[PDB]
Structure 1
Amino acid sequence: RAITVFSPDGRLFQVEYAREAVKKGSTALGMKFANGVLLISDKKVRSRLIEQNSIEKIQLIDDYVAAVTSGLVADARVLVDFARISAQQEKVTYGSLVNIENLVKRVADQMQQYTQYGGVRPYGVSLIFAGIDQIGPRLFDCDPAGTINEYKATAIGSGKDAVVSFLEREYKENLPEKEAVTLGIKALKSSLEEGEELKAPEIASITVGNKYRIYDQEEVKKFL
């Protein structure tokens, strides 16, 4: 088979193959607004026996930082839990989480190790972290190789490319919360509206000076 070792063309094929795996996930996206950031995910719901709301793909890490994930579900869970405890570690050491940049890096390092070492495949998941720290609103992306990039808007999963182009053209940097989620849902629409359906996305927002607010079923459909 193959392992993380460099190919003759300078590529870590296991990482490449990892990246393929995130592409086969469910789309989710996010972007900053005037004074906060929002995360809005597609809901991999198709069965009616699935418990709707209970399956949350926007998960909180700490009251003021959430992450929405894409990729292999299982690896996403564990890695999400890694992040939670790492946040808590900073709270117990330093008193507070003063930089979300840090939080995302530590988690990144974890993934970079499994991409360095043999006897272990890479972590095949992608995630974006958003939240507000002392610096202000931050939107970060995390890749299977451990790569981190800081965004204003970014996407992940199946509608990665699709959503990317939408955002690439139509994103306005300071936009009020309302208009912003709408823009999101339009971008998510274009993409995911290739089955000619979208249903209701799961939507969360945070604004400076407060905690994360995860919306309810009824609200979302109004912006839908």
Structure 2
Amino acid sequence: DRGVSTFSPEGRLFQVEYSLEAIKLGSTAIGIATKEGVVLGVEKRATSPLLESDSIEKIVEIDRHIGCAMSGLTADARSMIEHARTAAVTHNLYYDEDINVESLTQSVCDLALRFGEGASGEERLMSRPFGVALLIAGHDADDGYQLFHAEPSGTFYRYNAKAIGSGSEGAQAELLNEWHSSLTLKEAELLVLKILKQVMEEKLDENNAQLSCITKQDGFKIYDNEKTAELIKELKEKEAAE
């Protein structure tokens, strides 16, 4: 609507608020973070049998130990992904050191939150305004596994589990009690599938759901799809036992 200068009588920019509305529209992405690894799951989404589910991807490795999921406006995200990759490889050159997942996010936010129709201190190559969320996950040595929520309104928040998209409203409440410090790997896998099932109409099956993980030892690893299939099957056995 209104200018980059224009501030609301609420206090917050107009642009920023309109941007929040989009995220709901975008894909359901849920993470649970644990100290043996972060587990990420996304509905890849089928809408026609013609559409080739397998070809498209929603989780993309930016680094050999950092992966990213996108929810929101998928047009904007092409840039985001390309900036990210660039940033990570700049540090790897300069310092030859673990890609802090914290430092990678900080680079990202300079690029994202710098819209303006003309600035005189800063290069304007943006007009409007990068309204996209990313859940930025990985391991960095010093501080172990991290998971951030990248926010178009301002400073990123660290999370221990977070749920975004269409299914956020139901999921997020669930995540308050069920997130605990006794989720091992095995549990974390199962739990994400569980929530994802209840809150989305789209039937959980591997042709439209996919899992991913970060183990420092093997790096960011996108799972083969056979693996995924076995897990969906164990889940069903436990839901039908109770």
Distance in 2 separating the partners of 1:206 and 1:149: 19
Give the TM-score normalised by structure 2.
0.85
Q: Which residue of 2 aligns with 1:25?
A: 26
Q: Match for 2:204 among 198, 202, 213? A: 198
Instruction: Choose 177-186 or 118-127, whichever is displaced more.
Output: 118-127
1:144 matched to which residue of 2?
152
Q: Which residue of 2 aligns with 1:66?
A: 67
Q: Offset at 1:137?
A: 0.3
Q: How many residues align?
A: 220
Percent identity, please: 40
Per-residue deviation, 1:199: 3.2
Paired letter, 1:50: L
2:185 aligned partner: 177
Superposed CA RMSD = 1.6
Aligned-residue offset at 1:186: 1.0
User: Taking structure 1 as reference, are residues 136 and 8 closer, same or farther at Cα in structure 2, changes over 3 Å only?
Assistant: same
CA pair 196-58 structure 1, distance change in 2 beyond 3 A: closer
1:87–1:97: 8 Å Cα contact kept in structure 2? no
Show structure 1 runs of 4+ deviating over 4 A: none
Larger radius of gyration: 2
Contact 2:65 2:214 in 1 (8 A): yes
Tell me if structure 1 keeps the 8 A contact 2:92–2:99: no
Could you tell me how far 1:95 is from its partner in structure 2? 0.6
| Secondary structure at the counterpart of residue 66 of structure 1 | strand
- Residue equivalent to 1:153: 161
The residue that corresponds to 1:77 in the other structure is 78
Unpaired segments ≥5 residues, structure 1: none
Q: TM-score, normalised by structure 1?
A: 0.92
Instruction: Check the 8 A contact 2:35/2:145 in 1, yes or no.
Output: no
Q: Do 2:88 and 2:99's aligned partners in 1 also have CA atoms closer than 8 Å?
A: no
Match among 128, 135, 147 for residue 135 of structure 2: 128
Q: Which runs of 5+ in 2 are unaligned?
A: 119-126, 233-242
SS at match of 1:139: strand
> What's the offset of the Cα at 1:174?
3.7
Distance 1:178 1:19 in 2: 33
Shift of 1:196: 5.7
**Equivalent-residue separation in structure 2 for 1:214 and 1:70 (angstroms):** 18
1:207 Cα deviation after fit = 1.7
